Ligand binder design. Structure first.
Ligand SMILES: [Ti+4]
Length: 677
């Protein structure tokens, strides 16, 4: 009925929901977002209600968001509350482990150390840390309080049972569950570390900032990272035990009215949001506290539609809560790397992966997903481990927290596994004839692109020029040009040749298609052409027999540079738009070492050493084309220092694809950006 049935868990919430209803009726048009109220006994009954189509939306803490996700409910986050500004929303907080500088231990070696918890049963203080360390605990892990007591050599766990397990109160005897215990809560847990009682304090990111105003004092503290490294306390976003959403509205995954819910809550915060009206305070509780929404909430934000619970909570939070609830660890905790789960994007990719798996003798396993973004999501949540990606998807995967580990090398050499190729150089070519041309005044000139959606011919150049575009109409920057794959009637199709049906088409039929074609576009009808550094040489000195390219001199053309200067073709290395990276294998950081190791083995067994791809299995050969890896892949090379998407792609490339993604939307990128801007 275009009506949103909100579920309340108390009589107080029901009343507020009724006020919310009546008021929203007075300000919203006859045909607009309406609200009905449904009262149930608890949050769980509300989750079941929504799943049963008896309600539509409820706001939940992280733990209950996970509950709502499980079957048969299958709810998902749709709207989130934020507690800061539009620039600093603070939708999430980060559970971190604070420690003294140079204490001499990491996450993987916390046994025998002393711990300070905010309180037993709390998220950052207990559930999350203990969830992650669950398998590192001694058996029997049940009851849990006992297992933790044995793991640490003394600690402070407020509200714990000191009578049966006194070791948990060693740092705060009695385990006082009130502020009377100086080591209770966030302030207390931090003080437990500060006074030297404990070695580590499991708290929020903001905790140390609340208990120490001088940065000089904070410098003696640092955080434990899950990759068993330490970092400064203000780098918690890169070093945290988990990332937690504070308050999130959930609805059905299918037919949950997520758009309608957003419409409702959006107009709601508009009229009755924070300090918006005196008639009704959406984020104020007249009777109770934190009714329907947290009272500290400043407003709402739409959760990107690609998001699901697993992705929203993060692999850390899910790992922890699963460990506590399921309580399953490998009975044979062998230090050998588990099979690498490769992700296949197609039927043929899967068939090749299946052959690879059999030959690997269990070292490789296979998982299928519908699209590239689905595979990335699977690597994020753990349903898969590794996959090969091009530059654009390495960028998206990087924004999603994954890291590159191995690059595909395409050049034949004696030792390619130790010489990662940075790829060719994308450059902008213009004739020496027009001396007025410069990277700045390209606006209104004639351009030649290999094709739309191309690294050197389009994405890099048009991405860097985006600041000059100021919008998403890229055919309006250049007066005319040839960019195969455009709308045909576009200005970027005006200079194209080809035939009627093959006009402005991305294929051989178009004569101005490709690097050579864009060069043809340049020499015949055009001012600038975007290609790679080997294009001009290969098409000059008589090296190209075609008539138009029959007799051209390399010295007749020059490269545009970013700062505005010009140089000859020979100096492409110092004058270029950006470097076009090779494909690279990406994975989750915790799986980097294993993926890096096992692939090397597989590479040596089935790489470019085999001759009979018939009698053996060739990893870099495809029954069709470029399955899992590019067929012209010589070998996979270790990346050394370039083990992040920023370091691997380069500043100009990430700048280009980043700007360009503002116009071309990616559902996955939206989601990952939401969790980490
Ligand atoms: Ti290319």
């Amino acid at each position: 009925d275009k009506t949103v049935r909100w579920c309340a868990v108390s009589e107080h919430e029901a009343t507020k929901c009724q006020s919310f209803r009546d008021h929203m009726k007075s300000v919203i048009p006859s045909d607009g977002p309406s609200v009905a109220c449904v009262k149930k006994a608890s949050y769980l009954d509300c989750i079941r209600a929504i799943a049963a189509n008896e309600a539509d939306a409820v706001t939940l803490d992280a733990g209950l968001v996970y509950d709502a996700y499980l079957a048969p409910n299958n709810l998902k986050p749709v709207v989130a509350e934020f507690y800061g500004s539009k620039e600093d929303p603070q939708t999430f907080y980060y559970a971190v482990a604070v420690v003294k500088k140079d204490s001499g231990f990491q996450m993987n070696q916390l046994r025998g150390k002393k711990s300070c918890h905010t309180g037993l049963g709390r998220s950052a203080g207990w559930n999350i840390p203990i969830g992650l360390l669950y398998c590192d605990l001694p058996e029997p892990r049940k009851p849990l309080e006992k297992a933790v007591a044995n793991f640490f050599s003394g600690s402070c766990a407020p509200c714990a049972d000191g009578t049966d397990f006194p070791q948990l109160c060693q740092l705060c005897p009695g385990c006082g569950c009130s502020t009377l215990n100086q080591y209770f809560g966030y302030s207390g847990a931090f003080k437990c570390l500060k006074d030297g009682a404990g070695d580590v304090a499991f708290v929020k990111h903001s905790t140390i900032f609340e208990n120490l105003a001088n940065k000089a004092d904070r410098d003696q503290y640092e955080l434990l990272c899950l990759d068993n490294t330490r970092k400064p306390v203000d780098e918690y976003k890169d070093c945290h035990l988990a990332q937690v959403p504070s308050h999130t509205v959930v609805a059905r995954s299918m037919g949950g009215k997520e758009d309608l819910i957003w419409e409702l809550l959006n107009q709601a915060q508009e009229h009755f949001g924070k300090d918006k009206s005196k008639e009704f305070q959406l984020f104020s509780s007249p009777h109770g506290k934190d009714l329907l929404f947290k009272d500290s909430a400043h407003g709402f934000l739409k959760v990107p539609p690609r998001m699901d619970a697993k992705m929203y909570l993060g692999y850390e939070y899910v790992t922890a809560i699963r460990n506590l609830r399921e309580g399953t660890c490998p009975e044979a905790p062998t230090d050998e790397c588990k099979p690498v789960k490769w992700c296949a994007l197609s039927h043929h990719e899967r068939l090749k992966c299946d052959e690879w798996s059999v030959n690997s003798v269990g070292k490789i396993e296979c998982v299928s997903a519908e699209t590239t973004e689905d595979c990335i999501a699977k690597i994020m949540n753990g349903e898969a481990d590794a996959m090969s990606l091009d530059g654009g998807f390495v960028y998206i995967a990087g924004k999603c927290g994954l890291v590159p580990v191995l690059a595909e090398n395409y050049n034949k050499s004696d030792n390619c596994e130790d010489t990662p190729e940075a790829g060719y150089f994308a450059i902008a070519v213009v004739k020496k004839s027009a001396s007025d041309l410069t990277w700045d005044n390209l606006k209104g000139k004639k351009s030649c692109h290999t094709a739309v959606g191309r690294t050197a011919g389009w994405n890099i150049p048009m991405g860097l020029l985006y600041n000059k575009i100021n919008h998403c109409r890229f055919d309006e920057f250049f007066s005319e040009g040839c960019a195969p794959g455009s709308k045909k009637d576009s200005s970027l199709c005006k200079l194209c040749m080809g035939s009627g049906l093959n006009l402005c088409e991305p294929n051989n039929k178009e004569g101005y298609y490709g690097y050579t074609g864009a060069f043809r576009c340049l020499v015949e009808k055009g001012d600038v052409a975007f290609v790679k550094h080997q294009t001009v040489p290969q098409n000059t000195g008589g090296k190209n027999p075609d008539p138009w390219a029959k007799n051209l001199n390399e010295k007749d053309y020059e490269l545009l540079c970013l700062d505005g200067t010009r140089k000859p073709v020979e100096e492409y290395a110092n004058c270029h738009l950006a470097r076009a990276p090779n494909h690279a294998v990406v994975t989750r950081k915790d799986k980097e070492a294993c993926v890096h190791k096992i692939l090397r083995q597989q590479q040596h067994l089935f790489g470019s050493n085999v001759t009979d791809c018939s009698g053996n299995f060739c990893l870099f050969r495809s029954e069709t084309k470029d399955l899992l890896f590019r067929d012209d892949t010589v070998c996979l090379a270790k990346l050394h220092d370039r083990n992040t998407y920023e370091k691997y792609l380069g500043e100009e490339y990430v700048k280009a694809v980043g700007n360009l993604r503002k116009c071309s939307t990616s559902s996955l990128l939206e989601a990952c950006t939401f969790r980490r801007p």
